[PDB]
């Protein structure tokens, strides 16, 4: 199972548009996504390759043309669904970043990232996860460094029904923190929520994303009366996937538009996404 296997993994995305409603005038955009993985007993071999920079051009906010290629590496101290302990560290590289250095065009940046992995299981359906999203930026000057040290927790459940269709919930929780004196201010703690709920249908899967839709102040659910129709205004993110048994795994993104702030720069690039994972 895990010890001395070697699993491949390969996946690749895409992000393209309807080429505009009236009017074609744009050929080379978005870049693809490259991903790569080996698993070879407690150590996990990963390296994606990350690109983006279409023909697109700046020059004096930011800079993004070159990037680079990630690292990625999970080592399991102890594999128990009681008290699982993993610990996943990964290396980002970031070209460009920002002029400044009279020698060279573009400048890399070093980033740490680590992320416990904590598996421990409470009942014979309901699952318990735990995912410590920690960020280190580290560059060969650093004039400020923007931020000291990132941490993020994020606890995931996933619990079927009757071994099947699993309702997945992430609990984000990041806060600010610095190597200060005495000079804090009063930062914030931002939480995010996130919904989730991969199903499967014989050989199709189909994974819904929740977060937002509604506020109020007061109100409850109910037990005899339900609001299960398809009658209710609200996006919910639509993931599908095909194959996932020849080898490859295809996926897809599926979003309307809505809300905006722009009156013309528009709030999102792209609304269509296309992605796979092949892995065996």
Known sequence: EERNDWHFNIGAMYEIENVEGY???????????????????????????????????????????????????????LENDDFSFGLT????????????????????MQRWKIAPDWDVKLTDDLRFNGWLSMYKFANDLNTTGYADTRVETETGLQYTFNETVALRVNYYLERGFNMDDSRNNGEFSTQEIRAYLPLTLGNHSVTPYTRIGLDRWSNWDWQDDIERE????????????????NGLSVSLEYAFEWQDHDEGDSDKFHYAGVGVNYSF
């Not at 955009?29 to 993985?37: D, G, I, K, T």
């Not at 990964?90 to 460009?96: C, K, T």
């Open 89 to 108: 560290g990964g290396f980002r590289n970031y070209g460009y970043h920002y002029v400044d250095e009279p020698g060279k065009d573009t400048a890399n």
């Open 23 to 77: 009017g074609e005038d744009m050929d080379g955009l978005a870049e693809p996504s490259v991903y790569f993985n080996a698993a070879n007993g407690p150590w996990r071999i990963a390296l994606a390759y990350y690109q983006e920079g279409p023909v697109d051009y700046s020059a004096g906010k930011r800079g993004t043309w070159f990037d680079r290629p990630e690292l990625e590496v999970h080592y399991q101290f």
């Open 230 to 245: 398809g009658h209710d205004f609200n996006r919910v993110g639509l993931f599908y996937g095909y194959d996932f048994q």
